[PDB]
Ligand binder design. Structure first.
Ligand SMILES: CC[C@@H](N)c1ccccc1O
Ligand code: NA
Length: 330
């Protein structure tokens, strides 16, 4: 089997991407944030505290003929940005882009933190990191990918995120029309439950490539590119008037600037992030200070290749017995 679904930016900045997901019988379609950095599939629901729901579409298990309570199971998650949610668990039929899993754990939110409430465009998360990070207790649950895998034509999914445009998540096949050149594969460590890999270096603009190992995670659920402070300083030093602002919470730059590109290495291959991708616009409405898309990972404890980096590539998440990542230009 295979599946193919379009993923759409939630806003003009590509802060996140939403993908429609069918849950239950008859189908209830919810727009979920697919997250290669976490391992829970959780939704706004008929159980979510009413004051914490503001415009999201909810899953109502009582209207699904295939929903069953997973008795005794609870979940609670805390993300890198401080957001969180928690609740109880159903099993139900879940379909993505025509690929169906029966008996998927669908984590029903009883509580969501204010960042979730405030964002009416995200109806929940679909985690695509390793199932070792799933938070269901007392019986840990599998991701949608892990449950689909044995049915798939090839044990893979691909992320093809758009810049200010829709893109695609495919399951079970590699669309050879969706990228240019060849795919370069690189080793993955699963020891922290992430798609963790080592970039071979970077370049700023038309500058020389610096060979240096940068461990980090491929995270579709993080907006920005978080890299070591040395690398980030070297990037922003090439932008007139850029500075790190403790008041704003990262590097800002004059909105009048033209940003240089940023290149990262994948083995001997190179992925170029155009300068425009690194513009996250005014820090507040009408400001002439703009927020940068490359930020320091100091204090996060890991480097994160978030959407800024991933959207510049066609990315293969190879879930074979020995997982690997692939990157191609597009
Ligand atoms: C990434 C979109 C943003 N409005 C957001 C939405 C929900 C939870 C956290 C969070 O930062
Ligand atoms: Na923000």
């Amino acid at each position: 089997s295979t599946g193919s679904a379009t993923t759409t930016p939630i806003d003009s900045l590509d802060d996140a991407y939403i993908t429609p997901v069918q849950i239950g019988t008859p189908a209830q379609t919810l727009n979920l944030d697919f997250d290669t950095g976490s391992s829970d599939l959780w939704v706004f629901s008929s159980e979510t505290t009413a004051s914490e729901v503001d415009g999201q579409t909810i899953y109502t298990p009582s209207k699904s003929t295939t929903a069953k309570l997973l008795s005794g199971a609870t979940w609670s998650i805390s993300y890198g940005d401080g957001s969180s949610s928690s609740g109880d668990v159903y099993t139900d039929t879940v379909s993505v882009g025509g690929l169906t899993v029966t008996g998927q754990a669908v984590e029903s939110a009883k509580k969501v933190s204010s960042s979730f409430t405030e964002d009416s465009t995200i109806d929940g998360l679909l985690g695509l990191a390793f199932s070792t990070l799933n938070t269901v207790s007392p019986t840990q649950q599998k991701t949608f990918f892990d449950n689909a895998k044995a049915s798939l034509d090839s044990p893979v999914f691909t992320a093809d995120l758009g810049y200010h445009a829709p893109g695609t998540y495919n399951f079970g096949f590699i669309d050879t029309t969706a990228y240019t050149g060849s795919i370069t594969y690189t080793a993955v460590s699963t020891k922290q439950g992430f798609w963790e890999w080592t970039s071979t270096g970077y370049a700023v603009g038309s500058g020389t490539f610096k060979s240096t190992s940068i461990d980090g995670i491929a995270d579709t659920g993080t907006t920005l590119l978080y890299l070591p402070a040395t690398v980030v300083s070297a990037y922003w030093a090439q932008v007139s008037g850029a500075k790190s602002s403790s008041s704003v919470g990262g590097y800002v730059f004059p909105c009048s600037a033209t940003l240089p590109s940023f290149t990262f290495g994948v083995g001997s291959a190179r992925i170029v992030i155009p300068g425009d991708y690194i513009d996250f616009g005014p820090i507040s409405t009408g400001s002439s200070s703009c927020f940068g898309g490359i930020q320091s990972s100091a204090g996060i404890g890991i480097n994160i290749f978030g959407d800024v980096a991933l959207k510049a590539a066609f990315v293969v998440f190879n879930g074979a017995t020995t997982p690997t990542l692939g990157f191609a230009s597009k």
